[PDB]
Design a protein around this ligand. Structure first.
Ligand SMILES: Nc1ncnc2c1ncn2[C@@H]1O[C@H](COP(=O)(O)OP(=O)(O)OP(=O)(O)O)[C@@H](O)[C@H]1O
Ligand SMILES: O=C(O)C[C@@H](Cc1nc2cc(Cl)ccc2[nH]1)c1ccc(Cl)cc1
Ligand SMILES: [Cl-]
Ligand SMILES: [Cl-]
Ligand SMILES: [Cl-]
Ligand SMILES: [Cl-]
Ligand SMILES: [Cl-]
Ligand SMILES: [Cl-]
Ligand SMILES: [Cl-]
Ligand SMILES: [Cl-]
Length: 283
């Protein structure tokens, strides 16, 4: 097991409400990692332990180019340390804010990468549940690196589990079924995907309000609209994802999965097989 003294720590990359991510260089190899550090006392005191165990368990199952990788974990008297891959280019949200609206090529490319990632994730029977641009990081090559798995759920193949009961997520991206049926499924991530596509083109996510309760009320009534100049094929895709009935979302198991989603006309130009080796278009 690695130890804290095996690293030179640098700048804080981010601060969560129960964790801090710090850039670190491993002394023996000179490799750079993003180390998520948690204080045991705090975690135990504020019962966030379940989030911690869940994050480690889920990330340990993932081996795919479009996800942040957990290389190692270790601990000392007071803290837990997650050694994570370093996404040098930070979060996608930063680019949306700075650019305002992605062109069609960039929207399609990044959507395709997220679709690819979700296909892998859902194929392992895992629901992310907090898919959002803040949780989609970009590596030094500008490919996506999806992160934040403390709120993810590994569904049980043994009981053919399709629904999860924990109330987690971010209001803007929360699916209607979580609000009304108090449960989430793989399809809830497809809802979030629709929200993200809309946001890439529109600049803001579809269900907008100053507070959570107002957002919740709009989500359950599907109260949103498209701005002018919304790319037609993207609009068609968004409308097939932002559907109240979770069994009717393009991409979901009841709609026969990822084949039909990847076949949507929006992705007509996409070569799915080697996305992660393609040079992403310039934002
Ligand atoms: N692997 C990584 N590479 C680069 N930056 C990262 C990485 N993981 C997290 N970050 C940065 O750290 C910030 C917050 O990190 P962290 O996951 O500790 O908290 P959070 O999940 O955002 O908040 P909370 O603890 O409330 O869930 C993010 O905004 C992100 O920019
Ligand atoms: C092993 C599991 C574990 N979870 C814990 C939570 C607390 Cl608060 C204290 C000790 C713990 N050990 C473990 C899990 C995650 C990491 Cl990053 C390192 C080790
Ligand atoms: Cl430290
Ligand atoms: Cl450093
Ligand atoms: Cl590395
Ligand atoms: Cl590991
Ligand atoms: Cl919520
Ligand atoms: Cl509409
Ligand atoms: Cl169309
Ligand atoms: Cl593929």
């Amino acid at each position: 097991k690695k130890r804290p003294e095996d690293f030179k720590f640098g700048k804080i990359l981010g601060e969560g409400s129960f964790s801090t991510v710090v850039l670190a260089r491993e002394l023996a190899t000179s490799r750079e990692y993003a180390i998520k550090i948690l204080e045991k006392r705090h975690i135990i005191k504020e019962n966030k332990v379940p989030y911690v165990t869940r994050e480690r368990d889920v990330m340990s199952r993932l081996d795919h180019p479009f996800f942040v990788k957990l290389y190692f974990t270790f601990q000392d008297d007071e803290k837990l340390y997650f050694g994570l891959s370093y996404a040098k280019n930070g979060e996608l949200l930063k680019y949306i804010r700075k650019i305002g609206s992605f062109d069609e090529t960039c929207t399609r490319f990044y959507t395709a990468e997220i679709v690819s990632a979700l296909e892998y994730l859902h194929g392992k029977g895992i629901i992310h549940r907090d898919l959002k641009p803040e949780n989609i990081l970009l590596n030094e090559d500008m490919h996506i690196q999806i992160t934040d798995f403390g709120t993810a759920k590994v569904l049980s193949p043994e009981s053919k589990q399709a629904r999860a009961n924990s109330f987690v997520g971010t209001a803007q991206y929360v699916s209607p079924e979580l609000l009304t049926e108090k449960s989430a499924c793989k399809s809830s991530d497809l809802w979030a995907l629709g929200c993200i596509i809309y946001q890439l083109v529109a600049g803001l996510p579809p269900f907008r309000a100053g507070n959570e309760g107002l957002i919740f009320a709009k989500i359950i009534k599907l109260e949103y609209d498209f701005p002018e100049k919304f790319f037609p094929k993207a609009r068609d895709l968004v409308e097939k994802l932002l559907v109240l009935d979770a069994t009717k979302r393009l991409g979901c198991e009841e709609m026969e999965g990822y084949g039909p989603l990847k076949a949507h006309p929006f992705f007509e130009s996409v070569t799915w097989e080697n996305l992660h080796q393609q040079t992403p278009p310039k934002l």
